[PDB]
Design a protein around this ligand. Structure first.
Ligand SMILES: OC[C@H]1O[C@@H](O)[C@H](O)[C@H](O[C@@H]2O[C@H]3CO[C@@H]([C@@H]2O)[C@@H]3O[C@@H]2O[C@H](CO)[C@H](O)[C@H](O[C@@H]3O[C@H]4CO[C@@H]([C@@H]3O)[C@@H]4O[C@@H]3O[C@H](CO)[C@H](O)[C@H](O[C@@H]4O[C@H]5CO[C@@H]([C@@H]4O)[C@@H]5O)[C@H]3O)[C@H]2O)[C@H]1O
Ligand SMILES: [Ca+2]
Ligand SMILES: [Ca+2]
Ligand SMILES: [Cl-]
Ligand SMILES: [Cl-]
Ligand SMILES: [Cl-]
Length: 138
């Protein structure tokens, strides 16, 4: 029943958000120290992923995330019946925008099948967090 899926944050299928950050897209990509990551993530911004799950299970969520402010949080959601269901919300420690640290995101039950996952800038701050990748582990 062991399974592990690392999803690169830069490999979103869509991004969105209202915050005016002056960029071409509401969430941007950059590289630092060979880590490609999403940045310019603001409050209300989100990044959508499609994930194929062979093995049903209660997966643990781990983010490689960083922030340079207090008040960023990653809300992990799954689309269930054309309706986003909030799964976990995780504050991101303020240890520097480029300083990615493993961050425990709680757990989410994923059936065998294909899931739409949303990572949403859920905290109070105008600026939220940067994200290298996240890993789902059973
Ligand atoms: O006599 C007294 C006055 O003298 C006069 O000469 C002056 O006019 C002055 O008047 C004041 O001037 C300042 C001080 O008070 C206000 C008054 O007008 C004014 O305040 C400034 O106003 C600015 C807008 O006009 C700004 O809001 C400024 O705030 C800052 O603006 C930028 C720079 O630093 C941040 C700060 O909010 C903001 O930058 C953003 O900060 C984010 C962290 O908060 C983050 O780093 C953003 O960047 C992102 O970081 C990582 C995530 O994604 C990417 C992205 O680059 C990256 O990986 C960043 O853009 C405010 O102080 C009298 O003194
Ligand atoms: Ca943004
Ligand atoms: Ca990455
Ligand atoms: Cl990926
Ligand atoms: Cl590194
Ligand atoms: Cl769950």
């Amino acid at each position: 029943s062991t399974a592990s899926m690392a999803v690169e944050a830069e490999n979103f299928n869509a991004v969105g958000g209202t915050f005016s950050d002056g960029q071409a897209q509401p969430v941007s990509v950059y590289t630092v120290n060979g880590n490609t990551a999403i940045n310019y993530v603001n409050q209300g911004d989100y990044a959508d992923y499609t994930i194929a799950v062979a093995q049903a299970g209660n997966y643990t969520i781990s983010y490689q995330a960083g922030s340079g402010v207090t008040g960023g949080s990653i809300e992990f959601m799954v689309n269930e019946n054309g309706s986003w269901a909030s799964k976990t919300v995780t504050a991101v420690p303020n240890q520097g925008w480029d300083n990615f640290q493993p961050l425990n995101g709680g757990s989410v039950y994923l059936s065998a099948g294909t899931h739409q996952v949303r990572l949403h800038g859920a905290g109070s701050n105008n600026w939220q967090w940067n994200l290298d990748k996240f890993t789902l582990s059973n």
